[PDB]
């Protein structure tokens, strides 16, 4: 599943028994209910530029 277009995951992808796919996020992020998107859980998550995000 993860082999093709990162399994739809915005960040990390895990393959499971059958057609089951689990998207995952880097620490400082939480997975949204769409099961593919990652939302920051912290003020300064990794790989985001605050001055660019704030404007």
């Amino acid at each position: 599943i993860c082999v093709n277009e990162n399994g739809g995951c915005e960040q990390y992808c895990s393959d499971h028994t059958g057609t089951k796919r689990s998207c995952r996020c880097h620490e400082g992020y939480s997975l949204l209910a769409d099961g593919v998107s990652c939302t920051p859980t912290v003020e300064y998550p990794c790989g985001k530029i605050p001055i660019l995000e704030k404007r």
């Binding site: 993860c2 082999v3 990162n6 915005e10 960040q11 990390y12 992808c13 880097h26 990652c38 003020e43 300064y44 990794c46 790989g47 985001k48 530029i49 605050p50 001055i51 660019l52 704030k54």
Partner: protein, 250 residues
């Protein structure tokens, strides 16, 4: 950085400045509040191990504006496979004595998971390379942080396009062969940052080349994807006496 631009203050918030006896040594990449990724070759001639400082939130070297945070380097971890004076396995993992405080000007770059980095980030063409290195080959170094956009090459295309050490599976080429744009020797240890779906990731470390922006040559970067597990296991370890530590690789 050759043929790039000033990185606007705060737009490279993971950039690290490495200092020895207060003098400019190399660049680095903040990957969390305690750990910095740099190049192993940066520590080849270090004698004063206790006088290593990492500065975060740096921009302009001539003025202190209050966004700078300094930390003493507690440990420098280098792979057992790296041979001083050579190009292969050019990675160093640095432990800060105390964590940096994240602010608008101090933010880590994401260390990606291996598979994601190999299958997805490896195919993002352009990435950003940054530092306070030489502005020209045999030129003055920069006072303000510089940034350059570079395209990545498959090792086969790099070898064919290049006019001398081998490009191993632990390296990748990025840049231009026209002599206009490149990272330079004072940029060593700095990031090669890849953007994917609104987030930036660490994919390479400024490593080596045949002179900066040399016609018929590309910049060579450490392939960080080969080191993720090595890095992850080390970040889970307790520090050891002595700053320099040689850890087995794989």
């Amino acid at each position: 950085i050759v043929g790039g631009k000033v990185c606007p203050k705060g737009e490279c918030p993971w950039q690290v400045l490495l200092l020895v006896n207060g003098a400019q040594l190399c660049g680095g990449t903040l990957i969390n509040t305690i750990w910095v990724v740099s190049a192993a070759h940066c520590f080849d001639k270090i004698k004063n191990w206790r006088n290593l400082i990492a500065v975060l939130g740096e921009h302009d070297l001539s003025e202190h504006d209050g966004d700078e945070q300094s930390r003493r380097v507690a440990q420098v971890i280098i792979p057992s496979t790296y041979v001083p004076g050579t190009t292969n396995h050019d990675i160093a993992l640095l432990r800060l004595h105390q964590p940096v405080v994240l602010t608008d000007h101090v933010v880590p770059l994401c260390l990606p998971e291996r598979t994601f980095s190999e299958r997805t980030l490896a195919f993002v063409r352009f990435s950003l390379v940054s530092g306070w290195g030489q502005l020209l080959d045999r030129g003055a170094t920069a006072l303000e942080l510089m940034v350059l956009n570079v395209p990545r090459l498959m090792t086969q295309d790099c070898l064919q396009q290049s006019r001398s050490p081998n490009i191993t599976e632990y390296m990748f080429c990025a840049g231009y062969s026209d002599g206009s744009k490149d990272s330079c020797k004072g940029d060593s240890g700095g990031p090669h940052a890849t953007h994917y779906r609104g987030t930036w990731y660490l994919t390479g470390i400024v490593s080596w080349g045949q002179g900066c922006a040399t016609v018929g040559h590309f910049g060579v970067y450490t392939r960080v994807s080969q080191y993720i597990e090595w890095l992850q296991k080390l970040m889970r370890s307790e520090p050891r006496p002595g700053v320099l530590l040689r850890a087995p690789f794989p």
